């Protein structure tokens with residue numbers, strides 16, 4: 644029997660679906676795991692790894708991040724509030740990346756995906772940092788279908804956390820690019836009711852949300868800095884068996900609380 648797991652099992656049973664959790668305390672090496680190696684749909688949470696892949700490319704292409712992109716209306720997608728606002732202005736690669744991370748801007752995400760060689764190009768970047776689980780197969784908005792048993796556009800909580808650690812705290816990006824990725828995540832506007840709701844107000848947090856909507860499917864991953872202590876990296880993913888099952892932000896926050904409590 645697994646006593647650590649029992650509160651997570653109770654939470655997912657009340658939710659009416661499955662919750663996947665992985666958390667790492669980078670100071671002690673302690674972990675918390677619940678369904679940590681199961682696949683869950685990425686939804687918009689791929690956009691954080693997208694921005695990291697762009698930062699990696701910018702290391703060897705001088706001025707890439709500073710480059711303005713002047714897209715047309717044909718590039719717009721529902722829920723692209725920054726791309727629409729700057730349609731008559733244009734946006735730099737850095738501004739598109741920040742919009743994808745911090746507002747989940749769909750047009751910005753698809754524009755950057757195209758620059759990288761599409762979903763396959765992002766998947767190849769994730770392979771290059773040692774992530775063998777991540778796969779992106781489709782673009783916005785098709786990638787949100789979240790069909791039970793479909794492995795397209797999925798990863799695991801453990802692989803998400805491991806890759807997030809490499810990119811925000813490890814050596815997968817050069818230091819100026821690692822710092823920019825952290826700065827973008829810290830400025831996220833979409834996650835105030837998820838992992839951020841589970842951490843003390845005085846701690847620093849960078850996160851990226853995802854919401855497929857269908858099949859009760861939504862998620863959040865984050866790097867968390869308790870004041871003066873080594874950071875924690877964690878991921879919380881959900882899904883449910885029926886198409887019209889509703890996702891829950893409160894369940895994600897409650898799972899994040901249990902993860903922080905279970906760490907040594």
Ligand SMILES: O=C(O)/C=C/c1ccccc1B(O)O
Nearest residue numbers: 686687722747852853854855
């Ligand atoms: O960031 C989120 O939680 C939701 C972003 C979003 C919004 C509209 C359509 C698709 C997505 B995403 O999850 O792919």
